Amino acid sequence: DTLIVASKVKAYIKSKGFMTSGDAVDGLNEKLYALIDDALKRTESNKRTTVRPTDF
Amino acid sequence: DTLIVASKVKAYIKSKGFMTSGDAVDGLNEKLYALIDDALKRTESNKRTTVRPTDF
Amino acid sequence: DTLIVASKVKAYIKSKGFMTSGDAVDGLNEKLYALIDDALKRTESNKRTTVRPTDF
Amino acid sequence: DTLIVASKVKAYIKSKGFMTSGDAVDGLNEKLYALIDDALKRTESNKRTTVRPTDF
């Protein structure tokens, strides 16, 4: 499932004077899943069941 | 601006047995902006203005 | 100060069939300082004074 | 193999007011190998075999 709002990612990239390839947002979606999986490991390592912003 | 679908991020975290704090999605959003800023630097370093999935 | 063992980073890169530019290890040193600074924020966020491997 | 100077990493962490767990440097080493593996993928994606600082 896509967790990313493609239009908002493309908008931010455009605001900096860059373009986005057709498959760029797919790559970022993969990185986002990795960031979350890493955060869950940190949450568990601190004996918590609630993910906090500082866990990412 | 939010780059993610909060409901889908919270759902994925719940599917792994975890809850999400009120500001956890905001933390992930901040990390995503940092990942994009890093990617723009990599795009420019390869004499491109089109961001590719491999730049993230 | 350099926190990286340049010879061991270059060795690992060589083992994968790649070469290392003259200024590559400097870039990785900068990323390492960022990783540590992020980890210290996570340590403090969990009311600890001792950095753990899971904080990185 | 360790890619970092443990004494200098522990010193930097101490300078910021923190202690380092016995296996904390091992955790950072693991993250560094991941950063290099990601960089090799970026190098190859730009039709290069020489890793640049901007690939990390």
Residue numbers in the entry:
A (entry chain A), B (entry chain B), C (entry chain A), D (entry chain B): 8 to 63
What does the paper say about this structure?
Histones are conserved DNA-packaging proteins found across all domains of life. Here, we describe HLp from Leptospira perolatii and show by crystallographic and biophysical analyses that, unlike HBb, it forms stable tetramers and binds DNA nonspecifically, wrapping ~60 bp of DNA around its core. The HLp monomer exhibits the characteristic histone fold, comprising three α-helices (α1, α2, and α3) connected by two loops (l1 and l2). Molecular dynamics simulations, DNA-binding assays, and heterologous expression in Escherichia coli, where HLp reorganizes the nucleoid, support a role in bacterial chromatin organization.
The best data set was processed to a resolution of 1.30 Å, and the structure was solved by molecular replacement using a dimeric AF model as the search template. The entire chain, except for the first seven residues, was well resolved in the electron density map. The asymmetric unit contained an HLp dimer, which assembles into a homotetramer by crystallographic symmetry. Within the dimer, the monomers are arranged in a head-to-tail orientation, with the interface formed primarily by the antiparallel crossing of the α2 helices at an angle of ~40°. It is stabilized by hydrophobic interactions involving residues V16 and I20 (α1 helix), a leucine-rich stretch in the α2 helix (L35, L39, L42, and L47), and F63 (α3 helix), along with polar contacts between loop regions. HLp tetramers assemble through two equivalent, spatially separated interfaces formed by the C-terminal α2 helices, l2 loops, and the α3 helices of opposing dimers. Dimer-dimer contacts are stabilized by a branched hydrogen-bonding network involving R49, S52, and N53 of one monomer and F63, T61, and R55 of the opposing monomer. HLp also harbors a conserved RD-clamp—an intramolecular salt bridge between R55 and D62—that stabilizes loop l2, a feature shared with both HMfB and HBb. Nevertheless, electrostatic surface potential analysis of the HLp tetramer reveals a continuous band of positive charge encircling the structure, consistent with a DNA-wrapping mode of interaction. The central α2 helix is one turn shorter than in the archaeal histone HMfB, while the C-terminal α3 helix is truncated and forms a single helical turn composed of the final four residues—similar to what is observed in the bacterial dimeric histone HBb from B. bacteriovorus.
